[PDB]
Design an enzyme around this catalytic site. Structure first.
Site, PDB file in Angstrom:
ATOM      1  N   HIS A  40       0.805  -1.245   0.000  1.00 50.39           N
ATOM      2  CA  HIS A  40       0.000   0.000   0.000  1.00 50.39           C
ATOM      3  C   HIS A  40       0.838   1.295   0.000  1.00 50.39           C
ATOM      4  O   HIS A  40       0.284   2.391  -0.171  1.00 50.39           O
ATOM      5  CB  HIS A  40      -1.086  -0.019   1.087  1.00 50.39           C
ATOM      6  CG  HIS A  40      -0.628   0.413   2.445  1.00 50.39           C
ATOM      7  ND1 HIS A  40      -0.314  -0.483   3.444  1.00 50.39           N
ATOM      8  CD2 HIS A  40      -0.523   1.644   2.999  1.00 50.39           C
ATOM      9  CE1 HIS A  40       0.015   0.180   4.540  1.00 50.39           C
ATOM     10  NE2 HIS A  40      -0.112   1.473   4.298  1.00 50.39           N
ATOM     11  N   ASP A  84      -0.017  -7.572   1.890  1.00 53.26           N
ATOM     12  CA  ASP A  84       0.462  -6.182   1.878  1.00 53.26           C
ATOM     13  C   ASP A  84       1.994  -6.131   2.024  1.00 53.26           C
ATOM     14  O   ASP A  84       2.521  -5.805   3.078  1.00 53.26           O
ATOM     15  CB  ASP A  84      -0.245  -5.367   2.982  1.00 53.26           C
ATOM     16  CG  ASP A  84      -0.007  -3.869   2.858  1.00 53.26           C
ATOM     17  OD1 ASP A  84       0.517  -3.442   1.809  1.00 53.26           O
ATOM     18  OD2 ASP A  84      -0.351  -3.113   3.815  1.00 53.26           O
ATOM     19  N   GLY A 175       1.878   6.978   8.476  1.00 54.41           N
ATOM     20  CA  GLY A 175       3.266   7.404   8.266  1.00 54.41           C
ATOM     21  C   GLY A 175       4.288   6.369   8.719  1.00 54.41           C
ATOM     22  O   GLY A 175       5.434   6.433   8.299  1.00 54.41           O
ATOM     23  N   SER A 177       3.547   3.223   8.092  1.00 53.49           N
ATOM     24  CA  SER A 177       3.254   2.174   7.107  1.00 53.49           C
ATOM     25  C   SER A 177       4.496   1.696   6.370  1.00 53.49           C
ATOM     26  O   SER A 177       5.324   2.504   5.949  1.00 53.49           O
ATOM     27  CB  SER A 177       2.287   2.701   6.051  1.00 53.49           C
ATOM     28  OG  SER A 177       0.972   2.823   6.586  1.00 53.49           O
ATOM     29  N   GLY A 178       4.601   0.381   6.194  1.00 49.82           N
ATOM     30  CA  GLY A 178       5.729  -0.221   5.481  1.00 49.82           C
ATOM     31  C   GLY A 178       6.930  -0.511   6.358  1.00 49.82           C
ATOM     32  O   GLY A 178       7.831  -1.243   5.956  1.00 49.82           O
TER      33      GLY A 178
HETATM   34  N1  LIG Z   1      -1.271   0.226  13.763  1.00 51.02           N
HETATM   35  C1  LIG Z   1      -2.252   1.026  13.323  1.00 51.02           C
HETATM   36  N2  LIG Z   1      -3.216   1.348  14.081  1.00 51.02           N
HETATM   37  C2  LIG Z   1      -2.166   1.543  11.917  1.00 51.02           C
HETATM   38  C3  LIG Z   1      -1.038   1.210  11.173  1.00 51.02           C
HETATM   39  C4  LIG Z   1      -0.904   1.652   9.865  1.00 51.02           C
HETATM   40  C5  LIG Z   1      -1.892   2.436   9.298  1.00 51.02           C
HETATM   41  C6  LIG Z   1      -1.673   2.858   7.901  1.00 51.02           C
HETATM   42  N3  LIG Z   1      -2.260   3.838   7.374  1.00 51.02           N
HETATM   43  O1  LIG Z   1      -1.950   4.117   6.073  1.00 51.02           O
HETATM   44  C7  LIG Z   1      -1.874   5.486   5.691  1.00 51.02           C
HETATM   45  C8  LIG Z   1      -0.478   6.009   5.900  1.00 51.02           C
HETATM   46  O2  LIG Z   1       0.412   5.336   6.629  1.00 51.02           O
HETATM   47  O3  LIG Z   1      -0.157   7.076   5.397  1.00 51.02           O
HETATM   48  C9  LIG Z   1      -3.039   2.773  10.020  1.00 51.02           C
HETATM   49  C10 LIG Z   1      -3.171   2.324  11.346  1.00 51.02           C
END
Ligand SMILES: N=C(N)c1ccc(/C=N/OCC(=O)O)cc1
Ligand SMILES: [Ca+2]
Length: 223
Positions: A40, A84, A175, A177-178
């Site tokens: 993603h 993912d 932020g 993410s990844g």
């Molecule tokens: N652990 C969580 N609660 C969590 C982890 C990752 C995300 C990812 N969001 O994607 C949009 C971005 O990163 O810009 C959301 C919640």
């Protein structure tokens, strides 16, 4: 990262920032030429930034290397976030040192209860919005699959696991993410999704890296 701590400069030497004019995702360096991130996080024109602590200041230990290719998992589903995971190849090999180092892929899957290290430059608030300068860290346990499925009924596949705190207050976030979830010195998870961040009964959901080692090895052997 919500409810975590300042890691300390270059104490997470496999942590990378993906930059497309701005930081937008984390990633993990798995050898001198390859980064594992979330599918993603895919976009064109990625620059990989290694050796970062403060992402807004060049402090002297950084290596900025453009991606030559990105390979999204062939079964990635952006609706369900199943599979993912993505591999990013660097245009030139990173110079590996104390501040820039690869993280091992697992040979076996991690265990429920194991405390893992999750890191990133993502949002530090469970409600509002505040982005940190320096890399943030969180120690969080892997949750049982039954608690994970209970938290997210009908959404958890065998390629996902939950980690964190059902009481809320501590989690990865937008932020992050990844980025890496490292357990017992192996890359076991990738920051994937969750309902909000640090919400009660809504722990973080992570890509189960141990399921992808064969695909990773085959792909890097051929690209
Ligand atoms: N652990 C969580 N609660 C969590 C982890 C990752 C995300 C990812 N969001 O994607 C949009 C971005 O990163 O810009 C959301 C919640
Ligand atoms: Ca920097």
């Amino acid at each position: 990262i919500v409810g975590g701590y300042t890691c300390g400069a270059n104490t997470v030497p496999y942590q990378v920032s993906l930059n497309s004019g701005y930081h937008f995702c984390g990633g993990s360096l798995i050898n001198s030429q390859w980064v594992v991130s979330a599918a993603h996080c895919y976009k064109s024109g990625i620059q990989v930034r290694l050796g970062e602590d403060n992402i807004n200041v060049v402090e002297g230990n950084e290596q900025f290397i453009s991606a030559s290719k990105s390979i999204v998992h062939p079964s990635y589903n952006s609706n369900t976030l199943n599979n993912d995971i993505m591999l990013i190849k660097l245009k030139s090999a990173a110079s590996l040192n104390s501040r820039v180092a690869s993280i091992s892929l697992p040979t076996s899957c991690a265990s429920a209860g194991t405390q893992c290290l999750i890191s990133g430059w993502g949002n530090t608030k469970s409600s509002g919005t505040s982005y940190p300068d320096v890399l943030k860290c969180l120690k969080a346990p892997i949750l049982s699959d039954s608690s994970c499925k209970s938290a997210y009924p009908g959404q958890i596949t065998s390629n996902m696991f939950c980690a964190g705190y059902l009481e809320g207050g501590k989690d990865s976030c937008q932020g992050d993410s990844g980025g890496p979830v490292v357990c017992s010195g192996k890359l076991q998870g990738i920051v994937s999704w969750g309902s909000g961040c640090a919400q009660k009964n809504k722990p973080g959901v992570y890509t189960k890296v141990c399921n992808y080692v064969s695909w990773i090895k085959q792909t890097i052997a051929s690209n």
